[PDB]
């Protein structure tokens, strides 16, 4: 018995990551095994760690956590440093609009576990962590139970399947901070401290948990690994466009008919995501904007872009929040400002005061209480959150809002007169 969870809709054209997770329930080890589960693990343990790294590299797999970094390359960087090494599954998923990782965790936990074991073996880590956000309690209990199932079937512990490889997976819980998804803050949290990002370099792959080489990978990234081993890298790379190959999860929300998670190839366009897969808009209203989480704002003129990690592609985590013609962009922008206000960790001065002032002033603007100085100040602070920032949050806290100022000037002007 687990806590109640809403039954998020899930749909796939590829039947890989969502092969089981398209059905909204826990799939336990027996169902997983019936689908040929843990056979990729068995094949992996008959390969050298170095061969596994090579396969993941050649697959073109990129991280699903936002930065799109080539996963094989990350692993290679870690293993060039002396052991011991650590492997961390980032299940902090707290960016607005983003709910792709939880359906893997909650419905097909063994897919994730199998990926963690193969990955840990690949980089020579004997201890792995899942850091799951505190607001996913069901995920936490489901993962603990799945780990025990795996122990019982001999997929975890010492000398796994007679290979000589030892692994324990520890499940840690967050406690309400979005910044703990940032890889260095996540590590600080795992060490029992406040989630404060660290100055990089060094990067975790060189000095991470307890100062040792550490690979941090997102849930979705890791869930690809069993497929790469099972199919082989060459067959995986046949999926979708050859430069951005394999499945991608797209969490779609807001004013669409069928909000939920879609498993699609990355040559899919944003227009197709909204209109072909997600069933179009509520009431068939015109699309006004798409927010890529709390990161970017695309206009209705930018819907024909690929959902890949190219320069002109959508990128990020594939998070798609749809606003239609009657939605107030300034009200929306305020919500984004409020998010960053609540999540800055405060270490860096322009980020600390800038995220606060951005939300404070924008609220005044929205409520029609802003002076001329508040207007000029809002503009200034929006452009000055980034300086001296040591992590991605400070770098992006002004970005979406700046884009709404550029793309929807007429809506902002209505508030200025107000």
């Amino acid at each position: 018995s687990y806590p109640a969870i809403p039954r998020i809709y899930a749909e796939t054209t590829l039947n890989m990551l969502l092969k089981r997770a398209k059905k909204p329930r826990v799939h336990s080890i027996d169902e997983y095994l019936k689908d040929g589960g843990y056979q990729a693990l068995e094949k992996a343990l008959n390969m050298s760690p170095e061969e596994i790294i090579d396969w993941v590299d050649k697959s073109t797999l990129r991280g699903g956590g936002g930065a799109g970094f080539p996963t094989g390359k990350k692993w290679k960087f870690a293993v060039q440093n002396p052991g011991p090494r650590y492997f961390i599954c980032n299940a902090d998923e707290s960016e607005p609009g983003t709910f792709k990782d939880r359906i893997i965790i909650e419905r097909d936990p063994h897919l994730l576990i199998e990926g963690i074991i193969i990955s840990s073996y690949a980089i020579g880590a004997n201890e792995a962590y899942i850091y799951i956000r505190g607001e996913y309690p069901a995920g936490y209990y489901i993962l603990r139970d799945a780990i025990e199932e795996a122990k019982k079937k001999g997929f975890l512990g010492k000398n796994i399947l007679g290979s000589g490889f030892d692994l324990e997976i520890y499940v840690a819980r967050g406690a309400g901070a979005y910044i703990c998804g940032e890889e260095t803050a996540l590590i600080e949290s795992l060490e029992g401290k406040r989630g404060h990002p660290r100055l990089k370099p060094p990067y975790p792959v060189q000095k991470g948990l307890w100062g040792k080489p550490t690979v941090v990978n997102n849930v979705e990234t890791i869930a690809n690994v069993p497929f790469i081993i099972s199919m082989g890298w060459e067959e995986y790379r046949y999926i979708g466009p050859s430069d951005y190959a394999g499945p991608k999860l797209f969490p779609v929300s807001g004013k669409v008919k069928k909000p939920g998670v879609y498993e699609l190839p990355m040559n899919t366009t944003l227009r197709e995501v909204i209109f072909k897969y997600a069933g179009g808009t509520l009431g068939n209203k015109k699309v006004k904007a798409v927010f890529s989480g709390a990161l970017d704002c695309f206009s209705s003129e930018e819907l024909d872009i690929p959902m890949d990690y190219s320069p002109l592609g959508f990128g990020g985590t594939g998070t798609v929040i749809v606003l239609t013609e009657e939605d107030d962009i300034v009200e929306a922008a305020l919500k984004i400002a409020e998010f960053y206000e609540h999540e800055t960790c405060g270490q860096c001065t322009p980020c600390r005061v800038g995220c606060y002032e951005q939300a404070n002033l924008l609220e005044k603007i929205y409520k029609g209480e802003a002076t001329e100085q508040d207007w000029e100040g809002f503009d200034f602070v929006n452009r000055n959150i980034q300086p001296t920032s040591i992590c991605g949050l400070g770098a992006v806290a002004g970005r979406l809002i700046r884009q709404t100022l550029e793309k929807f000037p007429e809506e902002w002007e209505k508030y200025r007169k107000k």
Partner: protein, 156 residues
């Protein structure tokens, strides 16, 4: 002085023994404490600090940093209401209205019986089912007042 009840102390010791190093268990322990008491009592932090072999200073800082922990109000059930972009767009305000009609309280307030506290939170990662709320560990889509009323009736 303050002492942890035996059933609680057992759980705490289990968490402390779970990871390779004791101090890694700090968040799990604090979750456990808040679960047990309905809040983090300030008096609890000194003995937890000792169990973790950490300075009290360190523990206090950690409690203050993480938004889920609450040192101020005891509540049996925390109603976490998402106030982020997607939920807002799809009807957070109607949920808050329904909550006020049913419980008589606004965000940040506790019912006079100590039973329910409304806690505004950032995105709960269920945006496709907006507007979202949790009641302790249980998570739900808000549909209507009649539906919310039925859901809350399960928490006694």
């Amino acid at each position: 002085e303050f002492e942890f009840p035996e059933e609680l102390k057992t759980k705490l010791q289990e968490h402390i023994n779970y990871f390779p190093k004791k101090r890694q268990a700090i968040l799990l322990c604090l979750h456990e404490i808040q679960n047990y008491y309905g809040y983090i009592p300030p008096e609890s932090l000194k003995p937890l600090a000792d169990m973790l072999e950490l300075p009290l200073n360190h523990v206090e800082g950690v409690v203050a940093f993480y938004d889920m922990f609450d040192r101020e109000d005891k509540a049996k059930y925390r109603i976490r209401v998402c106030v982020s972009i997607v939920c807002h767009l799809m009807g957070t305000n109607k949920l808050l209205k329904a909550l006020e009609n049913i419980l008589g309280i606004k965000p940040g307030e506790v019912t006079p019986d100590g039973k329910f506290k409304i806690v505004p939170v950032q995105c709960l990662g269920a945006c496709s089912e907006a507007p979202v709320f949790m009641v302790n560990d249980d998570e739900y889509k808000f549909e209507s007042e009649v539906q919310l009323n039925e859901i809350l009736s399960r928490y006694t």
